[PDB]
Each structure stands twice: as C-alpha cells, then as structure tokens.
Amino acid sequence: VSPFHLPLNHPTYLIWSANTSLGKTLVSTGIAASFLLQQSATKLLYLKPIQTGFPSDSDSRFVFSKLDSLSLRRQIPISISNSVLHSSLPAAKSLGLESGMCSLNFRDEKTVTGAPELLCKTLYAWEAAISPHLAAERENATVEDSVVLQMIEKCLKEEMDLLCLVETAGGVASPGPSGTLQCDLYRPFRLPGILVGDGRLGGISGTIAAYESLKLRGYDIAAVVFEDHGLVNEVPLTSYLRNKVPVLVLPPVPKDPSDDLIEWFVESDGVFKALKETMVLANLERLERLNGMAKLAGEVFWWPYTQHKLVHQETVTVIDSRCGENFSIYKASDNSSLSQQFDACASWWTQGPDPTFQAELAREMGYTAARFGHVMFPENVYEPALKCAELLLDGVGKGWASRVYFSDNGSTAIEIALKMAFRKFCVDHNFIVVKVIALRGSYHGDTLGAMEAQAPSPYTGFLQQPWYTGRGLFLDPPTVFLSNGSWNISLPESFTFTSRDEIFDKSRDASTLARIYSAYLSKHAHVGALIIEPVIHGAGGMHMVDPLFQRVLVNECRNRKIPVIFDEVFTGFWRLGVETTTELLGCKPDIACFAKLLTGGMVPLAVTLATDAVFDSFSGDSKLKALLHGHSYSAHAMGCATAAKAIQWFKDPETNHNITSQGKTLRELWDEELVQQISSHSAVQRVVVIGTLFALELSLYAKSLLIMLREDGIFTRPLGNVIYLMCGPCTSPEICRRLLTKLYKRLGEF
Amino acid sequence: SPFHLPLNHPTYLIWSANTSLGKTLVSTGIAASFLLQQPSSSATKLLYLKPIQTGFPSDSDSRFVFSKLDSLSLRRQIPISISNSVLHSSLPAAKSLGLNVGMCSLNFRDEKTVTGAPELLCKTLYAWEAAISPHLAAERENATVEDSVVLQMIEKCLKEEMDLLCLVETAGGVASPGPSGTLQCDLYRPFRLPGILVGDGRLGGISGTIAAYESLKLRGYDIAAVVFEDHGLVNEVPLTSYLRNKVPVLVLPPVPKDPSDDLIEWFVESDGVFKALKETMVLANLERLERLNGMAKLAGEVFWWPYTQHKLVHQETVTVIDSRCGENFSIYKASDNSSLSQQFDACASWWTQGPDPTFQAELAREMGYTAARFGHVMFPENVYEPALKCAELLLDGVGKGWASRVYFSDNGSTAIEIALKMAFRKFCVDHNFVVKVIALRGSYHGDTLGAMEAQAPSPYTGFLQQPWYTGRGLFLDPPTVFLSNGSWNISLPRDEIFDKSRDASTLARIYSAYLSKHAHVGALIIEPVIHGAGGMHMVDPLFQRVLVNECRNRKIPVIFDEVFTGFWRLGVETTTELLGCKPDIACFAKLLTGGMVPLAVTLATDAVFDSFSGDSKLKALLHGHSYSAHAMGCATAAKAIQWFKDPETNHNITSQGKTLRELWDEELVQQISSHSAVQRVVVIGTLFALELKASLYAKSLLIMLREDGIFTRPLGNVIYLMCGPCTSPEICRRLLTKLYKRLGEF
Ligand SMILES: *Cc1c(COP(=O)(O)O)cnc(C)c1O
Ligand SMILES: *Cc1c(COP(=O)(O)O)cnc(C)c1O
C-alpha cells in the first residue's frame, strides 16, 4: 500500500544464481565467514526470504551451522542465531508443530556476548523441493509480493561493521510463490547484488544470460563468482564484462557428500576476502557518488525553467531510479536512505507506466535498439514505424485522420501542424500575412513557431523570446471548475451543472450558451488556422475549458474554411481518461498533435496527424510544394516501437486494469468522497478532476504544502497557485486515494 | 562483402538454453514431421546444417539426424533420400576418421539416395575432435574459423538450395563462445534469422529458458516457439504467462532414460508436438512474408514523409528495411526471389550514423538497462546518473577549454534555438538592453521557425514553405575549399588549409577587412568547417577563425553549430581543434547519441550563463521540453562519447595520437578528383562527397549504386558516401571502388 524506506548506511546485497546447485548457499556462507572472522559491533544479517524443501533443507541452518564450525577452526568466537518466521502447514507438521501460512517460534541461538554477530532468518518456507510457485499452491499457502518486501524492509530497519545478504531462491527468473519471477519481485527495492555463475559447461552461456536478465531489469552486479571445473570459464566471462565487473573463481568443491567442507572454505578464504571486499568497495563507491551528486549538478547543469541563483544544494533532489510511478530518492540528511516518492507531476506530464509495464517496455526497447538502432525515414518503411502509424490511425485518429507525420517533440509537431494548416488555407482561399486564432492561456511548446501561437505575457517579453511577435487573435476562454460539491462555469470579462458529464453532453449544444458563444465568436492579417488545447489548458494552470465553447469554435472555423488543429500533446493517450479528446469534444479536427504520453513516458517522439485533404494541398510535381520540415531522428524505431507498445497496453483491459467495460474510458481513479471534501475546503478556489488528473487552486502557502507533501512521499511541482497530483493511466485508485488523503490532511494543517 | 539471403523458403536457427536439453532431438522431430507426409512430394526438402560441431567424430548431430530419419522412414513406411556431409574439421578430428593426415576440407559423405522421394540433406560445416567448448577446441587443436567465413559458408549453402525447409542447429547455449570466442548469438546476428528456443523442463529450467530467450530478444532476434521436454513440473505455465501467450510453448513427453533405447517410439509418441512445432514455424514465416510484401504499399498510404513530394514517389521506390546491423541495412526485395540483402547506409541516415555491429549490440543493453532503471525522470532541479555522466563527458571533451554549463534539449533545432536565446542575452547585457544574427549563406541550422531565421532567404523560405519566416540576419557568402585533379584549391565568392601559419598570410588580412566592413547583430552562428545540408561545401577554416575573432572583438557571442560535425563525423571530437578557436556557445546532437536516439545539448560559457542570473524567475532561461535530459538519450550519449573516443573500442582512433585515422583511400580519391564529370571532391573524417558538372545523371548513379548494395540520398548535384566513426577503411575502400566503377560507366 505504502512507500518504502531502505537504510543505505550499510551494504545489502542480493545473492542471485544462474541456476540451482551452483553453490549459492556456499557463497553466502563464505561471505559471512570472511566478514565475521577477523583480528565487536560487527554483524552479518543473513536473510533467505523464500525457502522450499523445508525443513529437510534450510539454507539459514546451513549458514548458521557452517559458521559455528568455522568459528572453531579459525579460533574466533561469535554469536549465532537461526530463525524461521513462517511456513506452510505441511512444513510445520514436519517440525512436529491464514493466507495458508503458519507462524513459527523456531529459533536456535548459540549466543556469545560482545562477539561478532550472525543473524540468520528464513522468512517464508514450504515443504516441496520444487519451484516456489508450485509449492505455494500445492500446500495451499501463499504470500503476496508486497508482503514479502514489507517483511524484508522491516528486517532491514530492525538492524540498521554491518553487512546484509539476501539469498534468492532459484535462478534470476524463477517464479516466486505468487508466480512473479524472482527478478521482478525484488525490483522495487533495486538492491545491488552478486551473481553466482556456472563453471561447468554451457555455464558461460547460463551465466551471461542470467546476468543479462538482471541488467535488463535495471540491477547492478558487483561481482560474478563461480566454482572451478577446469574449463577456464572465467576468460569469456571477463571479456564479455570488459573487466568492469570482477569474476572470482572458487576452487572445486569436494564431491564426497559426507564432506564437512570446512577445509574448502579455508582453501577459499582468498576468493572470499576478494568477494567480500568488492561488495564493500562497490557500496562505498556508490555512496560517494550519491553524496556528491546534488552539489555537482548545481555546478554542471543548466536546468530548463529554473532560476539558478535561487536553487540551493539542499533542494536538488537525487533520483537513483524509478519503479513505475515511484521515484527512488536518496537522502543523506536521513540515515542515508533510499525512499519512494510518488511522481505527482508525472515528470512534465509524460508519465504512465506501472512497474509491470516499465519492465515490459525496457525489453521491447532493448530489442528495438538491437534490431534497428536508427534507420533513415524518408521514402522508407520499417516495422515499428508502420505499426505505430497504423495504431495511431485506427485509434487516436480513427474517423478523420489518414496521414501520420513524425517529429521529435510537441513543439516540432505543433510547428509542423501550423505549416500544414496554412497550406490548406492558402489553397482554399488562393494564395498575405497569416495569423492563427487561439484561446489565451493555451500552451503549445517553446520553439519560436509554437511560441507565436501563445498570447502575449511576461513569458513573451523581449528578454525571454527576442523574436516573438504574437501572430494570432487570442480570445479569452470560459472555464469550468468544481467548488463546494458542484461544477460551475466562469465566463470571461466579456460574457451550475448537476454533474461533470452534463458539461460534455451533446444536448448542451442546443442550449443558450451555444448561441451566445456562436455570436461572440462569429463576430471576430488573415486568420488561417484554429489551434486549441482540448478540454484542459495544461501549462496555463490546469483550467478546464468549456467543451461546448470549443466545439462551437471548431464548427465555426470549419464553416469559414479554416483548418482546425487539436493540440493533444498533453491530453492524448489516457491522460484525461480517454484516448483522444475527440471523444469528449464530439467534433473532429483537420490536424492534431501527439507526444508526451504517446511513448508511455519513456522516450521523446511526436506525431502530427492530418486529414487526406490537408495532405493533398502539398501534392504537385515540384519537390518545392512538398512539406520541407524534418529532423534527423524523425520516426526513430526506438520511439515508434515504444509508442506502438504503449498505445496497445494503455488500451487493453487485460494489461490496463483501469480500462472499463466499454473499452473507451478509464474508470474513476480519484475517490469521490475525498474529491467533494477537498473542493469544499475553506482554502480551495476550484478543483479540476478528470482521468488521471487532480488539481486545485488556492504563493508561499502552496510551497508550504509541497514541503509537507514531500514529507509524505509525494513529489510535485506547483503551477503558481495551482497544485496538482497527476498519476499514470494504469495507476490504481487505491494509490490515488492515498494521495488525496495525504493532500487533505496537510490541507487542513494550513 | 554484402550478403543476399533467399527468403522464399523458411530458415530457422535451433537455439538452446543449455546443453543436453534435446536440441538434436528437436531438429530430428521437425525434419521427420516435414519429410514424412502424404503428398510425398518429390520436391520436398529439409536442409539440415550444423555449422559448428565439437566432440567430432564420436558425436555428430548431422549423423544423428541422418540416421534417425532413416529409421523413421521405415517405421512410417514412407521412403526418402538422405545424405550426411562433413566439410571441414581440425587435424585431430580428421585423424580420428582414419583419413591419414589449420582447418582442412573433407570429402566425407554417406548418401542413401532414393530418387523422387523427399530429400534430407545434412551438413556439418566445421568440426573439432575434442569434446569441449568451441572456443577452447579451436585453440587446443590449432584450427580456427573466422565468423564471417562461417557466415559465408552458410550463405553459400542456402543459395545452393533455394516444399523446402532449413534448420541451422547452434552449438551450446545462446551465449556460448563460438570458435573465435564470439558468443554464438552475436555471430549469427548479421543474418538475423528467426529461430526457436529449446527450453528446460527440469527445474531452474524456467529461469534458464526465460533468460536464454531474453538474451536472444535483446540481440534483435524473433523466436517462433519455445519447446521443451516434460519433467512433471508444469514448467510451461510460467513460460506461457511470461510470453503472454504471444509465442507458443510446446511440451514434448519425457524422453526414455534407458541409454540403449533407440527413441523411435518417442518420436512417434511426439509426432503431435512436432507437427505443431513444424506448423508454427512454417506459419511464422508465411505471416512474416505477408507483412513484408505489403509494407511498401501501406507505407505509401499511411505515412507522410519529411522532405518528400508524395505525388512523385511510387510503390517501387519505397525501400523496405527489416533491420540494421552496424552500418548495413537489411533490405527486403520481392522482385528477386524474395530476398533480404545488405545495403550500406551511405547517407548515414540523415547523418546520424555511427555504430559498428559490435557497438550496436552493446548500446542495446545499455539502453535496455537504462529504460528499466530510469524510464524518464523529471529534470529541472534534479540529478540522476546518466545525465550527470553525460554532462561530465561533454564538459571534459567536446567543451574542454571553454565550456562550463550543459543545457539539454530534444534535437538540433531546439538546441540551436536555445543557443540563440542565450547569445542575445549575453549581447543585451554587455550592450545594455531589434536583433539579427550574422551567418554564412548556405549554413543550415534546423527546421523550427527560430532556427529557420538563421538561414539565408531561398526557395525553402518562400511564403509556401514557411509562412512566418522573416530572415533575421546578415548573410555573408563563404569562401569554400575543394579537391580537384589531385590538388586542393580555394573558391572565393589538406592539412595546410587548417594550419595556424595560414592566419598571418595574405587572405587573413583580406578577410579581416571585408568582414570588419560590415537591426543589431547580436550573435555569430556558423556551421564549422562544413556546410552539410548546403551541399557538403567545406568552408575555409581560416575565414571562420577570422570571423570568430572579429565577432568576439566586438563583444558578439559566437555559436558553433556542431550538430553535424560533433563526435568524429569529421575525424575529430570537435571542430574546435580544426578551427583553432573557441566559441561562447555550441550545439550538439545527431552523432551525440551514436545514431540510436534523439538528444541535443547546447554547451555554454560560464559568462553566457551568468547573464541569466538574478533573483527574478523571469530572468531565467524559460525554454524546455517535456523529455529534456531523458535518461535514455543521456546514458546512450555517455556510452557513445566514451566508445568513439577509446582506441580499445574504436580501432579507427589512432593508438598513439588518439585521433581518428584517415578512412578514404588516397588513390581512389585523386581518381574521382581527376575524373572529368567531377567538379569537386570534399573528403575528411567519415565523409566523402563530390559534385557533378545533370542531376538525372546523379539519380542514374544512385540506381547503379543501389545495385552494388549502397543506399544513398543525393543533395541535388552532390553525391556523398558517409560512414560511421568506427567503420573500417576496408569497407570504405570498397565503397570508393564501386563509386569509381559506376562513375566511368557514365
Ligand atoms: C508539452 C506540450 C507541448 C510541447 O511538448 P514538448 O515535447 O515539451 O515540446 C505542446 N502542447 C501541449 C498542450 C503540451 O502540453
Ligand atoms: C541536423 C542539423 C541541425 C538540426 O538537427 P535536427 O535534430 O535534425 O533538428 C542543426 N544544425 C546542423 C548543422 C545540422 O546538421
């Protein structure tokens, strides 16, 4: 349910394995001995989260017993304890002794006060020596992934010189109890690890492949280690890793099964010291980097949209990774800790993926890099660009669009749209100084051309954009807001809904306002293009524009033969609970732009969809009547495959549980009860809520709130007096509800 | 040379998660299912290739398939021809065969022929005696084979045979070193054959199966089916679930454990699973050909391409690209016998192109990992590793002795506009404050309106192409440099050219006067050394060095547009080395990411930065895009920057001087310069261009070069070949030879 805090003061490593029977428990045992036996407050925390084959086999007990033996051999006293916390029923009967689980009281503890401490813990145990996923259901005893991660998070905090080993169960891709592959299960924590390879044969292959399936889940591996079989397996391994990761070779394990193994551990102390130090150096080097990243960023970056004179080192957020909707954020100020923070600005409104879907995309992207890299677009065809165009045409552009034009970002797509619109215009009306018509407050990107479509303001003065001119007729939009339980309208200095759905309703078009609008609008340098930001003015302050007003404006502009541009860079692809705002405005454009969420938040890519007619206006025999706009990476396979995936994933009820019965809409994500309350709060002007967006309007008092929300594990950037939480199309309502609860609690604390 | 693989008939690799999984049993089952049929078509053929084979001759998968099919032919009562060949083996292998003998070719063959019957054709290409790893056997038995030799051998076998099905059985796991030490999966990559994966029913087998699959996927391969042997663990359920049932998982019954069992009845018990597996791979090929065969047409109906007049493009000129491997497109043609073939990307895809096959594969993982670790992570006031690493590499290389700040954008166009805004500030602060830039007519700086304003009026700026253009600059005409008939000459409007001594010379004074002799000019913007889009004209560096010094003397900010030249395009990391002067502002993109993904930087001086400092959040630089500093591009550029730069990874970097070596053959160059149709040749770094004296004549040449496996887009009368920073001179030489040959044929 909630965000984790992982202490980073002490190193904690996963013990991964290419397969089973490679030595994994032997490796934990060697690390521990190397660390506990030297010449006080020294502690090795050994966790075997999942354990099958219990109780006849028990890696906790193995480590436990083997260290007791080594402590005598090496003549260095230590304390030791082994615990097992839970097991299925059949496991607990084997010892003599819910979700189908049993708690246990099982502990051994040969204590020796003041001596280095060994602390072994098995968290959950089953009986059959099979994959955890089979045991879970055969013994009708299971554990949820988050429960497993909470259990471990609890153990870590409970203990934090110090070292922690978390031993996996099976290969890197073995299903855990719930069927979730082991490598996806531990991903939220993103712990560094070591991989126990295979010295055998086919072992080079199995080792490289396990390593790759880890890498491609975002993990770091401090060392690969394996058991000598006389094949010199280490040479191809070291070469593949370009010797950036050390490969350690343990001597052959005795084959005689009655072997205590004591002398082998002694023979191997060298390799185990080396392995222990590598994971000690690796952590130290990682902390030194983390601890210097804020400062160095302040000296080396020039950030967009930030007045550097004002940013002080303490406000530079250090992000170490992301897992779905959560940043993993480093704080030195704590006990040096990585913790989760919900990305509530959705990172410049790009954000979409689930943890599940993030992992999926990563492979889809790896594969696309390896198959295509970047491949020249003009006059060419390759699969991911073709697939993407087909998905765009058959969804977002279903009943109007017939051509797809690729660019790099929202800004380029918009400029491409402006050029197309002015042609369909200078061809129907034969052609001249051209201006657009827009709604003051709409935002359309930062390149000069997209800048000209925005109304004069401070952001357009001579200092911010020297070549600005303001090439448009900017009308002031009526807006819609939610206050004290009901949706109102707020007309411009010129000029109560039951529910939010009434607003978007077709019957509303025959009403009074529709006439009042048609006149005020009709009543208005040649206007050669209509450009709107459908339903919502994003950058402008999360104002919901009256859809009726824009539906009417569109129909007017088309009646007078003016091309209509829908700027859906912000709204497109489930941001607002639909694939296209076309569905909400009830009218179609001639031109439309998409980006941001098009790639599901992973990589830049922009499309400008066009009508068959808009296209024809660029047809002729002169290569000069063509559209001469293009960038080097236009239609890059990377972004295209990524968009082709995201489009289908966001859309499919199988993969996106937020998708409804009808397939055309997201279920309501933000709690109705809370939404009322936050809007009826003596500090809120208005609330705008729809799809994945929740915003409110109230200076300082807002920056107070943010400081407070950061404390709750919610990162968010304010739009002046507008505070917004924005999730992804796949984010669960339970997550959103928690967001609103935290906002509401902090909101009363003034 | 470039390969041509027939695609008329399906050819699949047989990959394995490990060894001892059944691999040879799977080939054997496919072949039986395919050869033993009711049609008994005389022209039915299964080509079985075991390219690499160790443990020879006591074990021999060719012989296994061979013998086991003979057996099944009797059992199933359907006659067939069969033959087993071994083409090469180490010495120790050949002695084991008696043959009274560091590779050598054997005549060894057995061929129980039965005319008119379905044909089995088994071929082992290279064999080692020792039952050890191929990379170990190769050196222990002083007998090796180059990767390209192995691929040529296979290409030769395929052409020699192409109803029909072809199985190529791997040796070991997907990542087992081949004879040369190259991992098996990287070895077959250039061919990019589809395949099936033989998984592991055992235990740890789900893990090993997923991981083998993933190391395949992450080398760009497609897998039609996963198949494995039942061990009672129901391994197939997690597998099917991970693949979201988009790839079928087939489960064979347990193989008999008794070692003397001839397995005949198991193959019979398994015919169901083997039919299924044979159909899946026959259908995956059919579905792949249907797609391929409809891509050009559909592209014509669905795309709106940049820079192309659609009325003129016909279906027949739409190039179908199926993949790329380093510098080579793999291009589909139905006009052939439906064939995938290699074409050198000589336009470097809009001048973005860099990676080696080796480096392409490397970047792919680097990117997979970055997607999985970061996705996209909010930039302003934040820090994450790949962006920090990238900025450090930029500052310490490309901006070493002048730059102190790095600003991220999406492409060249956005970087340039960002640069323009920065320059006008350092200007409107030194001179206290209508602003125009000063540029060289012909320089190109991107297609967004602001970058458009820095380009001199032309047809591409008329009211139809850009309605809001204005031409906000003073455009001077550049002196150029060309190579003609063996010598470099100047055209007023090779090491000697870039030399510092040349600055004290005549021209330097003549230049200093004309430029000094020239609405407020508030920024200098050049495309250093080469005007790319403009026609691959080399601008006299002395002329630009002088212009820069002139503009700095009058307190005008200098912008270097290095989006095209940056990062080894022209044989150096920065044209700063070549011009011998430093900017205040510079833009990078295209090759910055090593040709993989968009990303742009605008490097700035400490001073240019300071002009945006104050207490008002309005004096800040208010330009930014949603994906600014995306971890994807950043990690990718952080890699590329180091890889292109390092003699260890880039063999074109000369080991002692740590610069790029010369790539374009001396002779062939003069020969094209001497040619009479050629006006000029410009050559430097990874670039070779020429202008003809007559554009039909250029389009004629391209048609002809495509025929030679060289794809390239013309700049009117300028024809250019452009390789990557890592491309071998041997490859380049071949390019020049083909251009020269076609150049005489007029
Ligand atoms: C973000 C946005 C753009 C521009 O996108 P970038 O990729 O940041 O240039 C244009 N229009 C709208 C409505 C947007 O939200
Ligand atoms: C390609 C290029 C640009 C612009 O790059 P895009 O990413 O295509 O916008 C700017 N200047 C020069 C010299 C270039 O070559």
mmCIF file of all heavy atoms in Angstrom, chain A residues 519-536, unseen atoms left out:
data_model
loop_
_atom_site.group_PDB
_atom_site.id
_atom_site.type_symbol
_atom_site.label_atom_id
_atom_site.label_comp_id
_atom_site.label_asym_id
_atom_site.label_seq_id
_atom_site.Cartn_x
_atom_site.Cartn_y
_atom_site.Cartn_z
ATOM 1 N N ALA A 519 -22.309 33.596 -31.501
ATOM 2 C CA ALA A 519 -22.329 35.011 -31.862
ATOM 3 C C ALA A 519 -20.992 35.698 -31.548
ATOM 4 O O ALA A 519 -20.335 36.237 -32.444
ATOM 5 C CB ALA A 519 -23.473 35.722 -31.138
ATOM 6 N N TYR A 520 -20.610 35.664 -30.268
ATOM 7 C CA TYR A 520 -19.393 36.301 -29.748
ATOM 8 C C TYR A 520 -18.141 35.853 -30.493
ATOM 9 O O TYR A 520 -17.106 36.533 -30.514
ATOM 10 C CB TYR A 520 -19.255 35.969 -28.267
ATOM 11 C CG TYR A 520 -17.860 36.117 -27.714
ATOM 12 C CD1 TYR A 520 -17.477 37.279 -27.041
ATOM 13 C CD2 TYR A 520 -16.918 35.102 -27.839
ATOM 14 C CE1 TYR A 520 -16.197 37.431 -26.514
ATOM 15 C CE2 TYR A 520 -15.636 35.254 -27.321
ATOM 16 C CZ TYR A 520 -15.284 36.422 -26.662
ATOM 17 O OH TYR A 520 -14.020 36.535 -26.141
ATOM 18 N N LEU A 521 -18.270 34.699 -31.120
ATOM 19 C CA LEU A 521 -17.174 34.026 -31.752
ATOM 20 C C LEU A 521 -17.191 34.407 -33.235
ATOM 21 O O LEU A 521 -16.208 34.908 -33.796
ATOM 22 C CB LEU A 521 -17.411 32.541 -31.536
ATOM 23 C CG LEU A 521 -16.257 31.595 -31.693
ATOM 24 C CD1 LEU A 521 -16.570 30.335 -30.914
ATOM 25 C CD2 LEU A 521 -16.103 31.314 -33.197
ATOM 26 N N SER A 522 -18.337 34.187 -33.853
ATOM 27 C CA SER A 522 -18.593 34.608 -35.218
ATOM 28 C C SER A 522 -18.289 36.105 -35.451
ATOM 29 O O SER A 522 -17.952 36.512 -36.564
ATOM 30 C CB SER A 522 -20.058 34.305 -35.539
ATOM 31 O OG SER A 522 -20.320 34.300 -36.922
ATOM 32 N N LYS A 523 -18.398 36.916 -34.401
ATOM 33 C CA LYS A 523 -18.189 38.359 -34.513
ATOM 34 C C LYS A 523 -16.738 38.752 -34.784
ATOM 35 O O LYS A 523 -16.456 39.917 -35.049
ATOM 36 C CB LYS A 523 -18.717 39.080 -33.264
ATOM 37 N N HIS A 524 -15.819 37.796 -34.710
ATOM 38 C CA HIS A 524 -14.413 38.088 -34.992
ATOM 39 C C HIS A 524 -14.003 37.653 -36.396
ATOM 40 O O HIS A 524 -14.144 36.481 -36.761
ATOM 41 C CB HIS A 524 -13.504 37.441 -33.948
ATOM 42 C CG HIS A 524 -13.613 38.065 -32.589
ATOM 43 N ND1 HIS A 524 -14.746 37.961 -31.810
ATOM 44 C CD2 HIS A 524 -12.738 38.815 -31.881
ATOM 45 C CE1 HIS A 524 -14.558 38.611 -30.674
ATOM 46 N NE2 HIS A 524 -13.347 39.137 -30.691
ATOM 47 N N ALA A 525 -3.705 40.947 -41.987
ATOM 48 C CA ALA A 525 -3.811 39.864 -41.009
ATOM 49 C C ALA A 525 -4.959 38.921 -41.376
ATOM 50 O O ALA A 525 -6.122 39.327 -41.360
ATOM 51 C CB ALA A 525 -4.010 40.437 -39.604
ATOM 52 N N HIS A 526 -4.633 37.676 -41.723
ATOM 53 C CA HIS A 526 -5.650 36.692 -42.107
ATOM 54 C C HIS A 526 -5.624 35.458 -41.206
ATOM 55 O O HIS A 526 -4.622 34.745 -41.148
ATOM 56 C CB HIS A 526 -5.439 36.251 -43.551
ATOM 57 C CG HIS A 526 -6.326 36.940 -44.536
ATOM 58 N ND1 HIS A 526 -6.119 36.869 -45.898
ATOM 59 C CD2 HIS A 526 -7.427 37.705 -44.364
ATOM 60 C CE1 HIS A 526 -7.050 37.567 -46.521
ATOM 61 N NE2 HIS A 526 -7.856 38.085 -45.612
ATOM 62 N N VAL A 527 -6.729 35.211 -40.505
ATOM 63 C CA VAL A 527 -6.855 34.026 -39.654
ATOM 64 C C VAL A 527 -6.850 32.791 -40.538
ATOM 65 O O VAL A 527 -7.801 32.550 -41.280
ATOM 66 C CB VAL A 527 -8.157 34.048 -38.795
ATOM 67 C CG1 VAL A 527 -8.395 32.714 -38.159
ATOM 68 C CG2 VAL A 527 -8.080 35.101 -37.711
ATOM 69 N N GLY A 528 -5.775 32.010 -40.461
ATOM 70 C CA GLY A 528 -5.611 30.848 -41.319
ATOM 71 C C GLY A 528 -5.493 29.511 -40.606
ATOM 72 O O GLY A 528 -5.089 28.527 -41.218
ATOM 73 N N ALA A 529 -5.856 29.470 -39.328
ATOM 74 C CA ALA A 529 -5.724 28.249 -38.537
ATOM 75 C C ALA A 529 -6.349 28.418 -37.158
ATOM 76 O O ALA A 529 -6.111 29.418 -36.478
ATOM 77 C CB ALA A 529 -4.247 27.850 -38.400
ATOM 78 N N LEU A 530 -7.163 27.448 -36.751
ATOM 79 C CA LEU A 530 -7.635 27.382 -35.372
ATOM 80 C C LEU A 530 -6.741 26.423 -34.587
ATOM 81 O O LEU A 530 -6.496 25.297 -35.040
ATOM 82 C CB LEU A 530 -9.068 26.873 -35.318
ATOM 83 C CG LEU A 530 -9.490 26.526 -33.891
ATOM 84 C CD1 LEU A 530 -9.417 27.768 -33.023
ATOM 85 C CD2 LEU A 530 -10.873 25.907 -33.825
ATOM 86 N N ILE A 531 -6.248 26.860 -33.425
ATOM 87 C CA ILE A 531 -5.445 25.989 -32.571
ATOM 88 C C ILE A 531 -5.894 25.978 -31.105
ATOM 89 O O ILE A 531 -5.818 26.972 -30.383
ATOM 90 C CB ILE A 531 -3.934 26.293 -32.685
ATOM 91 C CG1 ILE A 531 -3.111 25.137 -32.090
ATOM 92 C CG2 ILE A 531 -3.593 27.625 -32.017
ATOM 93 C CD1 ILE A 531 -1.607 25.388 -32.077
ATOM 94 N N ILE A 532 -6.365 24.827 -30.666
ATOM 95 C CA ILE A 532 -6.781 24.695 -29.290
ATOM 96 C C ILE A 532 -6.020 23.596 -28.549
ATOM 97 O O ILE A 532 -5.455 22.685 -29.157
ATOM 98 C CB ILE A 532 -8.274 24.384 -29.186
ATOM 99 C CG1 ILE A 532 -8.568 23.027 -29.815
ATOM 100 C CG2 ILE A 532 -9.113 25.496 -29.813
ATOM 101 C CD1 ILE A 532 -9.998 22.615 -29.685
ATOM 102 N N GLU A 533 -6.008 23.721 -27.226
ATOM 103 C CA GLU A 533 -5.586 22.672 -26.309
ATOM 104 C C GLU A 533 -6.874 22.081 -25.730
ATOM 105 O O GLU A 533 -7.466 22.649 -24.807
ATOM 106 C CB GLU A 533 -4.725 23.281 -25.202
ATOM 107 C CG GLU A 533 -3.894 22.303 -24.400
ATOM 108 C CD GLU A 533 -2.939 23.011 -23.451
ATOM 109 O OE1 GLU A 533 -2.840 24.265 -23.527
ATOM 110 O OE2 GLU A 533 -2.291 22.305 -22.634
ATOM 111 N N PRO A 534 -7.332 20.945 -26.285
ATOM 112 C CA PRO A 534 -8.684 20.450 -25.977
ATOM 113 C C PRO A 534 -8.957 20.184 -24.489
ATOM 114 O O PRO A 534 -8.137 19.576 -23.794
ATOM 115 C CB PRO A 534 -8.781 19.149 -26.791
ATOM 116 C CG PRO A 534 -7.786 19.307 -27.892
ATOM 117 C CD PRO A 534 -6.660 20.108 -27.291
ATOM 118 N N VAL A 535 -10.107 20.669 -24.024
ATOM 119 C CA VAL A 535 -10.634 20.400 -22.684
ATOM 120 C C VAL A 535 -9.835 20.967 -21.504
ATOM 121 O O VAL A 535 -10.410 21.442 -20.528
ATOM 122 C CB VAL A 535 -10.890 18.915 -22.482
ATOM 123 C CG1 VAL A 535 -11.628 18.688 -21.168
ATOM 124 C CG2 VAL A 535 -11.708 18.391 -23.636
ATOM 125 N N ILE A 536 -8.515 20.928 -21.592
ATOM 126 C CA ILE A 536 -7.693 21.405 -20.500
ATOM 127 C C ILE A 536 -6.555 22.284 -20.990
ATOM 128 O O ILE A 536 -5.879 21.964 -21.958
ATOM 129 C CB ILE A 536 -7.096 20.218 -19.711
ATOM 130 C CG1 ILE A 536 -8.187 19.474 -18.937
ATOM 131 C CG2 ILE A 536 -6.032 20.702 -18.766
ATOM 132 C CD1 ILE A 536 -8.596 20.129 -17.626
#
